[PDB]
Amino acid sequence: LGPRTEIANRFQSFLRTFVDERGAYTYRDRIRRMCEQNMSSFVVSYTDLANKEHVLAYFLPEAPFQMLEIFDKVAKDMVLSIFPTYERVTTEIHVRISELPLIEELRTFRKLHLNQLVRTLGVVTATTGVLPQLSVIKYDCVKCGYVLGPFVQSQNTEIKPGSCPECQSTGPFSINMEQTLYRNYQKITLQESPGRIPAGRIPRSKDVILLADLCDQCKPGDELEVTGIYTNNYDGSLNTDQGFPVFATVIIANHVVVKDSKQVVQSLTDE
Amino acid sequence: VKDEVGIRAQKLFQDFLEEFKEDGEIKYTRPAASLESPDRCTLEVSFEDVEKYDQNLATAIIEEYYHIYPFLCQSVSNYVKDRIGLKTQKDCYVAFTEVPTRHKVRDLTTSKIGTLIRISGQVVRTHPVHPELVSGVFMCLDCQTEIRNVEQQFKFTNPTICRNPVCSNRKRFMLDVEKSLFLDFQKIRIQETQAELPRGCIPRAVEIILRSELVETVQAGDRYDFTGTLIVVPDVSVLAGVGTRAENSSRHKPGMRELNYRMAFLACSVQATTARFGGTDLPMSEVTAEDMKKQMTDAEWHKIYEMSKDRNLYQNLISSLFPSIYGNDEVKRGILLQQFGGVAKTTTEKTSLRGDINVCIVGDPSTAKSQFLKQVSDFSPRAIYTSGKASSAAGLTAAVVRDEESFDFVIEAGALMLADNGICCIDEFDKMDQRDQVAIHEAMEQQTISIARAGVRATLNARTSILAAANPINGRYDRSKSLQQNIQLSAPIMSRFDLFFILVDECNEVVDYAIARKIVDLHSNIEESVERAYTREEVLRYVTFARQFKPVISQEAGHMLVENYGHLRQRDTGTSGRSTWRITVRQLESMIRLSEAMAKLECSNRVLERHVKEAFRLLNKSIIRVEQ
DNA sequence: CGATCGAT
DNA sequence: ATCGATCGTTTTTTTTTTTTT
Numbered sequence: 001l002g003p004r005t006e007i008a009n010r011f012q013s014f015l016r017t018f019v020d021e022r023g024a025y026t027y028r029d030r031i032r033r034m035c036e037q038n039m040s041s042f043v044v045s046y047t048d049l050a051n052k053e054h055v056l057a058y059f060l061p062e063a064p065f066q067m068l069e070i071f072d073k074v075a076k077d078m079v080l081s082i083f084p085t086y087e088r089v090t091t092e093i094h095v096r097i098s099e100l101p102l103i104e105e106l107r108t109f110r111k112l113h114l115n116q117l118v119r120t121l122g123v124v125t126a127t128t129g130v131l132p133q134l135s136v137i138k139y140d141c142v143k144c145g146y147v148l149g150p151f152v153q154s155q156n157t158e159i160k161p162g163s164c165p166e167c168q169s170t171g172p173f174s175i176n177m178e179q180t181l182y183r184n185y186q187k188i189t190l191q192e193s194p195g196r197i198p199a200g201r202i203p204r205s206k207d208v209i210l211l212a213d214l215c216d217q218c219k220p221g222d223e224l225e226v227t228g229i230y231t232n233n234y235d236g237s238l239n240t241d242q243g244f245p246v247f248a249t250v251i252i253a254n255h256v257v258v259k260d261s262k263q264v265v266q267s268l269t270d271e
Numbered sequence: 272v273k274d275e276v277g278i279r280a281q282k283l284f285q286d287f288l289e290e291f292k293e294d295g296e297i298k299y300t301r302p303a304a305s306l307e308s309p310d311r312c313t314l315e316v317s318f319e320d321v322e323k324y325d326q327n328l329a330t331a332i333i334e335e336y337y338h339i340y341p342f343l344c345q346s347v348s349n350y351v352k353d354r355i356g357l358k359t360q361k362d363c364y365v366a367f368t369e370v371p372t373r374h375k376v377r378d379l380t381t382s383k384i385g386t387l388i389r390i391s392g393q394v395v396r397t398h399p400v401h402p403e404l405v406s407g408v409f410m411c412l413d414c415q416t417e418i419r420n421v422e423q424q425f426k427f428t429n430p431t432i433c434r435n436p437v438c439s440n441r442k443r444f445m446l447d448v449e450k451s452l453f454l455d456f457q458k459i460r461i462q463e464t465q466a467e468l469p470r471g472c473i474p475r476a477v478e479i480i481l482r483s484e485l486v487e488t489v490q491a492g493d494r495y496d497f498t499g500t501l502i503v504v505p506d507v508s509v510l511a512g513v514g515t516r517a518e519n520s521s522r523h524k525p526g527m528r529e530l531n532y533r534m535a536f537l538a539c540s541v542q543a544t545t546a547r548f549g550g551t552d553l554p555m556s557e558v559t560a561e562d563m564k565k566q567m568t569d570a571e572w573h574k575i576y577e578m579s580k581d582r583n584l585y586q587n588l589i590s591s592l593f594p595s596i597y598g599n600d601e602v603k604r605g606i607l608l609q610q611f612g613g614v615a616k617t618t619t620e621k622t623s624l625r626g627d628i629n630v631c632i633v634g635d636p637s638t639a640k641s642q643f644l645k646q647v648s649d650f651s652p653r654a655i656y657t658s659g660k661a662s663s664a665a666g667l668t669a670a671v672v673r674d675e676e677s678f679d680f681v682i683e684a685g686a687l688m689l690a691d692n693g694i695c696c697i698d699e700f701d702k703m704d705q706r707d708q709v710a711i712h713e714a715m716e717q718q719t720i721s722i723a724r725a726g727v728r729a730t731l732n733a734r735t736s737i738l739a740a741a742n743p744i745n746g747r748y749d750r751s752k753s754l755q756q757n758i759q760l761s762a763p764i765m766s767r768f769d770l771f772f773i774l775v776d777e778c779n780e781v782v783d784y785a786i787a788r789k790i791v792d793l794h795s796n797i798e799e800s801v802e803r804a805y806t807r808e809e810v811l812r813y814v815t816f817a818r819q820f821k822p823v824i825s826q827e828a829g830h831m832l833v834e835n836y837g838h839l840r841q842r843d844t845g846t847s848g849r850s851t852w853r854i855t856v857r858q859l860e861s862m863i864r865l866s867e868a869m870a871k872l873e874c875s876n877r878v879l880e881r882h883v884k885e886a887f888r889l890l891n892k893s894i895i896r897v898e899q
Numbered sequence: 900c901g902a903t904c905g906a907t
Numbered sequence: 908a909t910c911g912a913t914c915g916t917t918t919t920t921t922t923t924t925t926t927t928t
């Protein structure tokens with residue numbers, strides 16, 4: 001729109017306009033430094049974001065999903081436009097945040113926190129190993145023997161259009177094991193620390209999702225700080241019910257931070 | 272429709288309390304007024320006030336409640352509308368009270384439903400928060416999906432026929448988790464009343480549920496007062512119910528589910544009594560409605576200034592909590608400093624700095640060193656006592672498990688360990704095994720402790736001081752061996768404990784008859800105790816206030832605590848020839864907070880050299896008291 | 900035992 | 908719209924070895 005175009009423009013006229021470190025801003029060059037090491041995990045400052053334009057604190061929680069998407073789109077359209085040399089290897093991006101003036105302990109988050117901006121910590125426990133999932137929907141026709149084609153995918157929902165090279169026909173189908181896009185996976189099970197309990201009873205816990213960029217960093221019993229966001233499996237079997245819906249809650253990680261972080265770590269001041 | 276009488280009833284109840292409700296004042300508008308900004312939707316209502324103004328809707332209420340209940344929410348919305356420019360976001364939680372009748376787990380029938388009755392019990396095997404998106408939006412697939420209807424029933428059914436069109440009536444739209452109606456509860460269990468403990472049958476247990484505002488304020492070891500909302504429970508499947516089964520076989524002209532329902536129970540009110548303390552901004556029995564730092568934190572300054580000003584109140588207060596007791600007058604003044612604050616500095620990231628101090632009792636047998644402390648559990652908050660052998664080393668630790676219940680290894684708490692900013696003293700420090708002993712060897716000083724063999728990154732912490740209960744070898748202080756052989760114990764804890772104050776026994780007849788003369792006013796059932804100077808209420812309020820002050824040292828005795836301590840180790844330069852003893856900077860640390868607390872008595876900051884001198888006197892007392 | 904699906 | 912003929916339908920167990928304090 002007129003205004004709904006200006007989101008990406010604000011990012012563009014942010015990353016090379018809001019400048020500190022005595023000139024020659026990070027996000028002028030920090031993105032270059034991300035492309036250099038082949039990471040694709042650029043991270044953003046909420047502090048600096050508010051120091052530029054406060055506006056995108058309220059325009060986030062109504063759908064932080066679309067905020068993050070409309071950001072990383074800008075990272076591509078900048079990178080491959082100025083670094084078309086990049087356009088072989090990965091050519092896909094998403095960004096992170098590390099400034100949220102809040103720690104929500106566990107046993108603190110409830111129905112108001114639904115599907116919006118979050119922070120919390122805890123302790124790791126046993127979880128899964130290393131697996132991928134899918135990323136794109138494509139099958140194979142057999143009435144005409146064609147491909148159904150690739151189809152636009154919703155987060156956990158079916159598509160099934162009639163349009164396809166088989167005279168837009170062939171309701172039935174089969175599926176291949178290739179020509180389709182993949183995505184690593186790993187899980188976590190988060191517990192709360194033995195210091196900040198309610199002083200003597202059993203503790204609480206909920207589970208957390210990490211994604212293909214995010215695996216083989218955690219371990220059982222490790223130190224941590226994560227933004228994450230509040231999930232909802234939208235149906236853990238609604239019907240003629242219990243005395244209670246069998247619902248659950250997860251957090252999906254955007255930016256995980258280790259609070260030990262025993263590697264060579266810090267950025268550089270300019271001088 | 273049935274309950275329109277209830278509609279008009281609570282309507283004109285509002286319309287009356289829309290005017291005054293109580294003496295030109297209303298008790299349920301300012302709670303609602305605080306509600307108006309965040310709009311949290313909980314307001315308890317007095318059940319007495321139905322009988323005051325509505326003239327016994329109680330019996331209009333206390334049977335058909337479950338059906339009437341929802342209309343009270345509409346009534347609530349109608350209340351909030353009248354003076355607030357209002358949207359229908361408003362809701363209705365209730366936490367009912369002012370109800371007389373108190374029944375228990377036995378008077379249960381089909382006839383007990385839709386009431387508000389108040390009930391207690393115990394709390395066991397608690398269970399967690401588990402949300403609920405009860406509502407959403409759902410109809411046919413094409414366009415006609417805007418559905419904020421009544422679809423939130425417990426028995427949930429996506430299938431709806433249609434609203435506008437002739438369209439799918441089993442093919443649904445997709446879901447709404449975005450702009451719809453959700454809420455929360457939890458689930459726990461309850462055992463039979465310990466006030467109603469008959470023979471024979473088991474502790475029949477009830478199921479229990481909690482709404483929003485009730486949540487995470489139930490807890491083990493607590494009795495309650497519920498609503499009486501016994502249920503028809505929208506259950507799904509069960510066995511052994513082989514009674515007759517029915518279902519509507521419709522009209523003949525030219526889906527199935529087995530039916531066996533079970534019971535549970537629901538409630539929307541709590542007064543978790545016997546578990547309520549309140550700090551200092553609570554107005555007590557004795558108050559003085561005045562201005563202060565906070566509401567009632569010291570608004571009795573009108574007296575507490577006086578209780579902080581006398582040079583006599585030291586001894587008077589030393590005598591204002593031992594009316595029924597008589598012994599030495601050194602622990603009667605020192606032991607309070609254990610309960611009294613310490614240092615409380617505002618300082619660096621060097622390491623945790625401590626406020627509390629170790630404290631001891633030793634004495635010969637039958638001296639009522641127990642009765643000093645038997646009351647202390649009844650006295651202080653956070654600071655509940657038992658013995659150490661009163662449990663296992665699942666006192667310090669939890670009960671060590673080696674069977675699978677949730678993840679097969681659980682040691683995450685204890686009994687010493689949950690005494691955060693209260694003391695949980697113990698008796699019998701001499702014959703207890705050397706396990707918790709070496710645990711305490713650092714758990715008192717380095718209040719940051721760990722374990723292995725089952726550790727979820729084990730990092731626990733002690734918080735308070737201690738009270739000891741030694742007794743000699745022979746039962747008597749027969750001066751026939753050194754103290755290190757009189758008790759047969761270790762050094763560092765005899766230095767970790769910076770304060771001893773042993774209570775020695777003798778035989779002089781006047782003493783014992785003077786004790787019986789205490790007894791003269793122990794069973795004179797009118798005047799079975801001695802006079803006092805200061806009531807308990809003001810006492811504990813002054814105690815609760817005297818911390819919030821930032822004690823300080825800038826004093827030349829602060830500069831020349833070097834002098835008194837140099838003399839401390841000058842006179843203690845010996846204590847090495849005849850049965851050597853050891854000096855150590857824990858003594859200095861202890862004297863420091865001791866002097867500081869001794870000035871915290873003053874309701875004042877800023878240490879004075881009087882406090883150093885008395886502290887030096889008292890340390891001299893303790894160390895020469897250690898002399899054989 | 901249930902839903903799909905075809906025609907009458 | 909109505910009836911009827913089409914399609915597709917499945918669930919049952921308890922106990923022994925090595926390990927840790």
Ligand SMILES: Nc1ncnc2c1ncn2[C@@H]1O[C@H](COP(=O)(O)OP(=O)(O)O)[C@@H](O)[C@H]1O
Pocket residue numbers: 595596597598635636637638639640641642786
């Ligand atoms: N000054 C006193 N005031 C009140 N009671 C006392 C006093 N001196 C002795 N007693 C009584 O003597 C008894 C001491 O027993 P206690 O010391 O508790 O046994 P133990 O020596 O095993 O600890 C108490 O019951 C207490 O009532």
